[PDB]
Amino acid sequence: VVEGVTFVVEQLIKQSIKNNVAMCFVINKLDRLILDLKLPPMDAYLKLNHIIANINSFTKGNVFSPIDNNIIFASTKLGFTFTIKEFVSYYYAHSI
Amino acid sequence: DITVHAPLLPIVEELMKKRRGSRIYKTIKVAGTPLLEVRGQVPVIESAGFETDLRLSTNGLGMCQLYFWHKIWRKVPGDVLDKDAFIPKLKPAPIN
Amino acid sequence: SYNGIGLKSAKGSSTSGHVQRSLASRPLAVQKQIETHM
Amino acid sequence: QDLSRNTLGDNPRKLSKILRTEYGWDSLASRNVWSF
Amino acid sequence: PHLYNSRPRSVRIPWYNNPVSCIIQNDEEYDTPALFFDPSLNPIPHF
Amino acid sequence: DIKFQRENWEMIRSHVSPIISNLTMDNLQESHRDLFQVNILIGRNIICKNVVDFTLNKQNGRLIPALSALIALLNSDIPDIGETLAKELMLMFVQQFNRKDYVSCGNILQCLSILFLYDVIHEIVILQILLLLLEKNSLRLVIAVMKICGWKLALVSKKTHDMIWEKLRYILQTQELSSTLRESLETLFEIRQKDYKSGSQGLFILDPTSYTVHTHSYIVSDEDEANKELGNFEKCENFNELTMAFDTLRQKLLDVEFKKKIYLVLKSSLSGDEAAHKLLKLKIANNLKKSVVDIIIKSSLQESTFSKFYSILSERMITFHRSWQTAYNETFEQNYTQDIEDYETDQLRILGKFWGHLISYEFLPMDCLKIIKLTEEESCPQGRIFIKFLFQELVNELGLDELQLRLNSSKLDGMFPLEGDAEHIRYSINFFTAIGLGLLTEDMRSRLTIIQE
Amino acid sequence: TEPLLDILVKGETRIQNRVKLGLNSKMPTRFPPAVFYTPKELGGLGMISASHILIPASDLSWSKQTDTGITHFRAGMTHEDEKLIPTIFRYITTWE
């Protein structure tokens, strides 16, 4: 999350598009918004939006967003990953 | 590609002035963080110990990556056929 | 030793081994062949 | 900058077409390419 | 040590790097809550 | 009776006009002192009318700091002018804001903000401004006031300051904006990030001397309107007592140890490089450098012979920084001009070899020999044998070829004349042939034949 | 002749050490330079010094290969009572 889409990420996207492989993006270290940077949650949502918009700037035609589950949120230090589909499956699907 | 805390940009640009032929082209304000992403160039012959100088001068609040996937080749100053140019024995040579 | 300067050790040197930097320191024929080639 | 990336714009007519077009070569030199 | 020395006998490999620290600290006594947008941070202009 | 008071008003009104109109930062002190040549203490509102006219009409975008300093300097002793001008500027703002005149609003806030950077204005004035600005979403002005004086609010009134920065961040994060305004917001945030004090266009340098300032407070949300006719003459009671108050306020306002250390550096050093390093590590002040070079000369002269130690020492210092080079130049001048008069022949031999050595390797330029002017009366015998040993050292190092090339280049007319008197040229030829450098004389010898016949 | 300067420094130190071990104590603070270098008629030993110089120092490899020049200085004999003791060399006229 912190450094986000750097130039190294840009070239990795470009090489992935060249190599004819399906891209999928893991946005890792979400704890660093919560604990390190201590952002309030609205600003963290805006941060994630800035990241995902930057991803979409280099994936030429293909669109990436969490509701398409091409984005995964993660904190591999604290042992978790999730997608929107996963979270609603576990904790909201039973209540609608 | 240099990632550094924003108030320490003067040190980074001073280092990029000390090294020969190095230039800074763009500064990215990394949103929602205290960091800047500083994009520039340095010749490979001038690159020895660049990472160590940058990390020590910034007290560990800066880090950099050096890469050659964009294959930039540039003219060295001076003339190769200049027979009587001054070349020191131990100091690094002047530009011409 | 630091930056290639100084003793192996101050031990046995009879000195402190302190180091300090010194502040005191008309055309030719072959040329016409391009003109022919044009 | 294009050939650095192994790209232009090995068939002779196609290569001569793009040499004539994008890189502005004379047709004579465009067909007289012998290796990249 | 193995690049810049000709005979690195008995050296040990150093730890290379850690990611750059971005631990914001709450300076103020009471008026600043636990979660806040510190002045050091760049804004987020995208919309 | 009253006509005299009206004239006393109007003479100020005419007098002050160039004192105000020429205001730039070079002259805030001059304009401050000059304004007290006349009784502004009774004629208070005259300057205030000029300020409101100036800020409205005259597009003083880079000049408003000088005005802000001038009112601060007036408030330092006559605070009635501050007390009023607070109102005068606030009423200027609210009117021009209602006229949608952005440029004059810029002028009025640039003033008021610097007047809060100085302790002329109370924080409520700026907060009554910021209330007005945010209730009509005039953000581009908010950037100006926050940039110029925001840190003062951060210290005085932090609890509200967090809410101002919160709303600005919300704006930049969530709202569609003109790119000029967006860039202004981004630079404002950069200023808060890096160096928040960097908005100081206002000359806070005046704070130690202007310390007698004091803040004034006002509320413009009440139903006031600008008393724009107050600049004209109004009758004064207690006029003579206030005149005496004004006049009284005006008349109120209107060696051996250093030598020892240097000598012991020289005597402790094996090599001239070591001596130079030991001297350069002392960080000798610029007024003392000349004395250090005098000590180096005198110590070199107490020796039995010349030594390359003193040459090397001098060269290393001359090349370290230009101040040493200038010191050595003026020491050569000082030696030849003053104190060779009382040096014996062997010490002159040492001096000649020393300076000639420094001239040979071009640490002293050849142009420095222009001080020598060589006639029987213009020179002295000690000087003449000093020149002998100097040129002898020059010949020994360079050889007559390279020496003659440099002497031709350097235009040393004082000792190699061509246009002078025949006796003058003859004397120069006799000197140079006597010391054994006769081959240098050939050009001026030939010219001597021409001027004789 | 830098090896001779090293040998000189060691020799003067050992000569002083003979005196110190005569007094069963090598401790520096007991024996300031005034004890050794004060002349005899003032009750000192009247030693003449060559070892309180700075010794020229240089990169060993570069010095093996070419004339490095004096880039750095080693400390010779030093005492906490820092005094600028003169050298014998400054009072002898050189042979040239």
Molecular structure report:
The structure is cut from a larger assembly and holds three copies of chain A, one copy of chain C (38 residues), two copies of chain E and one copy of chain F (453 residues). Chain A has 96 residues and is of the alpha+beta class. Helix content of chain A is 46%, strand content 11%. The termini of chain A are far apart. With 38 residues, chain C is of the alpha+beta class. In chain C, 16% of the residues lie in helices and 8% in strands. Chain C is rod-shaped. Chain F has a domain at 1-231: Serine Threonine Protein Phosphatase 5, Tetratricopeptide repeat (Alpha Horseshoe). Chain F has helices at 2-21, 28-35, 45-57, 64-75, 80-98, 102-117, 123-134, 139-156, 158-174, 179-194, 239-253, 256-267, 272-280, 289-302, 308-320, 322-337, 345-360, 381-410, 422-434, 442-452. Chain F is elongated and about 100 Å long. It is classed as splicing. Keywords: spliceosome, RNA. Yeast C complex spliceosome at 2.8 Angstrom resolution with Prp18/Slu7 bound. Chains A, B, D: Pre-mRNA-splicing factor SNU114.
Give a concise summary.
It is classed as splicing. This is part of a larger assembly, with 3 copies of chain A, 1 copy of chain C (38 residues), 2 copies of chain E and 1 copy of chain F (453 residues). Chain C is α+β, with helices and mostly antiparallel strands and 38 residues long.
Helical residue percent of chain E? under 10%
CATH architecture heading of the domain at 1-231 in chain F: Alpha Horseshoe
Which quaternary structure do these chains form? part of a larger assembly
Name the structural class of chain E. Answer: little secondary structure
Structural class of chain F: mainly alpha
Our estimate of the beta-strand percent of chain F is under 5%
Helix content of chain F: 55-70%
Number of strands of chain E: 0
Greatest contact between two chains: C-G, 16 and 23 residues
In angstroms, what separates the terminal alpha carbons of chain F? 93 Å
**Count of helix runs of chain E:** 0
Share in β-strands of chain E: under 5%
Q: What does the main sheet of chain F amount to?
A: none
Tell how many strands the DSSP assignment of chain F holds. Answer: 0
Topology-level CATH name of the domain at 1-231 in chain F: Serine Threonine Protein Phosphatase 5, Tetratricopeptide repeat
Largest sheet of chain E: none
Radius of gyration of chain E: 21 Å
